[PDB]
């Protein structure tokens, strides 16, 4: 269907304990394929998915170069912004960036994004029209100016429309046997008696991809209220995901309850029972 490639930058200052550490991860869809950590003994961009390993030495030399240059730049960002806000020399401060591009089923650019964040809050983002900036505050507007006068937006649009999309398609191509494929959840129900009067019914979905999923409990064919105990969808470590949903039920009325699961990898919604 539709696909995305995204990069996540993070710079964290550590006053009186070294220079700010810089970390980056690349994703295509729900699949990380790339990483960089400036505290690594030999800071290099590194493969976290099979279909990028094939890339040539020129590629990696290039990516590592950007990462090292990004750590330098973001370190300035931290120092520059720290001044704007006139903050104490006390504790740590953060500068994040997320950028990338979405391509539709046809394979054309749906939209580009390039957001920045200071201390975990929106700071300045490139607008969906890839031409103007949105400043969140007094400081960000100073930054806004600098970028307008320098023509930063145009350069960003170049990469987002062109380079970003090209790479994305290439990766989709080179890693099609896993990127294009959806894995169905393996579902089951567990039975955890609370007391002689109540029991917990927990509905598991395991080993699925991508992470988007829907679990739900019904009684007699109608929804539950109230209510289902979820857990946030969590990685298994093997590139698939996990989720469960539980309900307390009258000890003896287990039959009234069915679990309902919907996921891309299922030809059709599934219905489980105890």
């Amino acid at each position: 269907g539709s696909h995305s490639m995204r990069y996540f930058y993070t710079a964290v200052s550590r006053p009186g304990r070294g220079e700010p550490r810089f970390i980056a991860v690349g994703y295509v869809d729900d699949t990380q394929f790339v990483r960089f950590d400036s505290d690594a003994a030999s800071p290099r961009m590194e493969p976290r998915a099979p279909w990028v390993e094939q890339e040539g030495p020129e590629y990696w030399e290039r990516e590592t170069r950007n990462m090292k240059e990004a750590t330098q730049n973001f370190r300035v960002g931290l120092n520059t912004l720290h001044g704007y806000y006139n903050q104490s020399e006390a504790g740590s401060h953060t500068l994040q960036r997320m950028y990338g591009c979405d391509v539709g089923p046809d394979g054309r650019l749906l939209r580009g994004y390039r957001q920045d964040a200071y201390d975990g809050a929106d700071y300045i983002a490139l607008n969906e029209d890839l031409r103007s900036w949105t400043a969140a505050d007094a400081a960000a507007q100073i930054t806004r100016r600098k970028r307008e006068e320098a023509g930063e937006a145009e350069q960003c649009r170049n990469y987002l429309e062109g380079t970003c999309v090209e790479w994305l398609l290439r990766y989709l191509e080179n890693g099609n046997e896993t990127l294009q494929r959806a894995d169905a959840p393996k579902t089951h129900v567990t039975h955890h008696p609370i007391s002689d009067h109540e029991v917990t019914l927990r509905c598991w979905a395991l080993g699925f991809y991508p992470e988007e999923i829907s679990l739900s409990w019904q009684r007699d064919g109608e929804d539950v209220t109230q209510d289902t105990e979820f857990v946030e969808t969590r990685p298994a470590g093997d590139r698939t995901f996990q989720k469960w949903a539980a309900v307390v039920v009258p000890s003896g009325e287990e039959q009234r309850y069915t679990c309902h699961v919907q996921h891309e990898g299922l030809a059709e919604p599934v219905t489980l029972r105890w």
């Binding site: 990069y7 980056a24 690349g26 790339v34 961009m45 590629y59 990516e63 950007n66 990462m67 240059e69 990004a70 730049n73 300035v76 960002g77 520059t80 912004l81 950028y99 930054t143 600098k146 970028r147 320098a150 023509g151 930063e152 350069q155 960003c156 990469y159 380079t163 970003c164 090209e166 790479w167």
Partner: peptide
């Protein structure tokens, strides 16, 4: 492929 940075797009 990550975004190359230049003196035009590295402002703060």
């Amino acid at each position: 492929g990550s975004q190359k940075l230049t003196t035009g797009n590295c402002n703060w």
